[PDB]
Design a protein around this ligand. Structure first.
Ligand code: A2R
Ligand code: A2R
Ligand code: GDD
Ligand code: GDD
Lengths: 309, 309
């Protein structure tokens, strides 16, 4: 009946809160933005790095569910901020887990991991299933791999109720800049608004990612909390690989001016996973989840968001 | 040739320093205690958690080799100090790597990892080789798995010269208390000296570990520095599994007096790897290394160290 979402003012957070409120769940959300407000959410000021405040907030609210979304979410920025990505993602998670363990709460925690935990996938391994070797290629990936490992250990050592996800690329209106669909859509609309030369600036167009709309993601998170098996890991993904080139092409075909493409070398990463496509069989079998929103719709709605801003 | 050993005043460090000085390597060593001192080592005061002081030391010395041993080495203690084990092992390592990166030094770094990175190994996987998946069971294991992943990433992203070890249990005279062969030997000699009732307090006797004498370990580290392949991971182990029961029985057979055995529940860990036995084939093939000192001899010399004060 009672859910706590850390990082509720983030991209996924707002959609998740909306989704839970519609399932008649009482929603509490935490953020560092002491002015942030969300419809039907009790908002709580919390820095996930303040271990004693994490333990106070969780002790006060006594949630039945925690969806732990507070994190440094950028792969790109983890190269520059390796330690900060690790302190926030690993230690923030530990503070949450230790709060529950200490309060001895009857609570299920969903920890949010990443397809970056897999990293380099052997061609024979794709689409990747949950038993696949973890070979992270980015510092972010190392942080999420550590979160997952600790999740499993807390289940084993302390009898806790934790489910870890490995979420693949998630997209939709409201995602911050620094992520590919936002970075591209934003330039396109600026070009339409004659605020930028008709030339779009891009990074690596050869990468392949598995994209799912944030609205489908939060349904999967809800369903996992309800039907998932304690201590299991679940891929949350569409099972379809799209080249970044084709994400760009889909977006450009929706623009109402002709647009040239140009390499921006500051968008390249020191090392990157060339391809990530996941198997969602475990998730589908456990929950009856299916993605519903096609990539084309997601991308169009992102363009619409910038256009109406 | 100049070598820098971090954590030089630790168990492995003192032996490694002695070994390197015998190879006509100029040895510089770091420790947090300013009242240390080692034959033929230039001692430097350094806390590995001080990123700017780490850079300064590495900038000053301009070493050809760094043997990075500074760490929180206890698996037992990692359950109580999860964040400290993480900050020291992962961030300490990042400080070293970034210092070398910044100074653009022509330097090979040996990062020291652990069989705890493997964790739970399937019977068909034993003895484990370096491509086995990582399924750590202890927070310590997560910290070392992260060190290894990051070492591989710095090679790939930045073109650095780094070799990572996965070292299995290492033993010998001078190891601190809190590790099994020391905890057992100390009590036996205290019992011989009539300082303790003839009952030894012990933890889990059913665990299996792969033991190698520290004098052999440091030869492996030296040889890897010379002959190892950049970006490769090497198990450093004997390939022989010994039950802790049998470790104890070997020690009791060497004692003066009949000694009974009793469980001390405080020696039990929340969750533990039942069995770790490694393949040393990659190391032997690359370097010609072989373990020379039998387990019985290591255990004997440990007892002698307590008996001789
Ligand atoms: N020290 C912290 N204490 C409390 N919250 C923190 C702290 N550091 C960061 N966050 C928050 O986490 C939220 C993460 O949201 P987004 O960056 O928009 O990511 P998204 O909602 O797409 O991803 C949610 C989860 O899904 C994963 O992909 C990602 O790593 C994360 O675990 C942000 O609002 C971010 O908030 P802020 O914008 O830094 O104030
Ligand atoms: N923040 C720190 N800054 C500088 N040094 C540090 C810091 N934290 C710990 N150390 C040192 O690392 C040394 C590690 O030595 P032992 O605990 O005796 O471990 P051992 O020498 O058996 O193992 C060497 C390597 O092999 C692995 O077993 C272990 O994780 C480590 O990576 C200790 O002298 C330990 O010294 P101290 O007793 O904690 O002062
Ligand atoms: N951001 C960005 N990415 C670009 C650009 N050009 C090409 N790309 C490429 O587009 C791909 C997706 O990058 P991002 O959208 O930044 O996300 P990510 O690095 O894959 O990480 C996202 O997905 C993970 C799940 O796999 C999430 O765990 C993570 O938090 C994030 O949402 C990457 O291969 C990136 O190099 C650009 O201009 N901007
Ligand atoms: N310390 C200790 N261990 C005991 C005792 N009784 C049983 N044990 C068991 O003896 C085994 C060895 O434990 P330790 O000597 O504490 O070492 P460890 O946890 O295996 O870790 C050591 O080896 C790793 C390499 O695999 C190293 O990475 C790590 O730094 C450390 O040296 C474990 O299964 C432990 O539970 C006891 O009284 N004391």
């Amino acid at each position: 009946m009672r859910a706590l979402i850390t990082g509720v003012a983030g991209f996924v957070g707002k959609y998740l809160a909306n989704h839970l409120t519609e399932q008649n769940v009482e929603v509490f959300g935490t953020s560092r933005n002491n002015e942030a407000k969300l419809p039907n959410v009790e908002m709580i000021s919390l820095d996930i790095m303040d271990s004693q405040r994490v333990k106070k907030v969780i002790s006060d609210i006594k949630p039945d569910y925690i969806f732990h979304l507070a994190a440094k979410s950028s792969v790109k920025d983890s190269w520059l901020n390796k330690k900060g990505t690790f302190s926030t993602n690993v230690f923030g998670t530990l503070h949450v887990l230790d709060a529950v363990r200490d309060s001895n709460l009857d609570c299920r925690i969903l920890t949010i991991g990443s397809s970056e935990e897999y990293g380099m996938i052997l061609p024979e391994e794709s689409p990747v299933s949950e038993e696949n070797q973890l070979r992270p290629m980015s510092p972010y990936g190392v942080s999420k791999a550590s979160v997952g490992m600790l999740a499993r250990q807390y289940v084993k050592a302390y009898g806790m109720d934790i489910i870890h996800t490995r979420t693949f690329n998630h997209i939709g209106p409201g995602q911050s800049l620094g992520f590919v669909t936002q970075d591209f859509a934003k330039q396109i609309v600026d070009i339409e608004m004659e605020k930028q030369e008709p030339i779009i600036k891009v990074g690596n167009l050869e990468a392949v990612r598995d994209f799912t709309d944030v609205r489908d993601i939060v349904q999967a998170y809800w369903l996992l909390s309800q039907y998932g098996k304690t201590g299991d890991v679940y891929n949350v993904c569409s099972g379809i690989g799209t080249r970044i080139q084709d994400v760009l092409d889909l977006l450009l075909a929706m623009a109402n001016v002709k647009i040239d493409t140009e390499l921006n070398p500051l968008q390249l990463r020191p090392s990157e996973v060339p391809t990530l496509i996941g198997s969602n069989k475990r998730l589908k079998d456990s929950t009856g989840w299916k993605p519903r929103i096609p990539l084309e719709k997601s991308l169009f709605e992102i363009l619409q968001s910038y256009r109406q801003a």
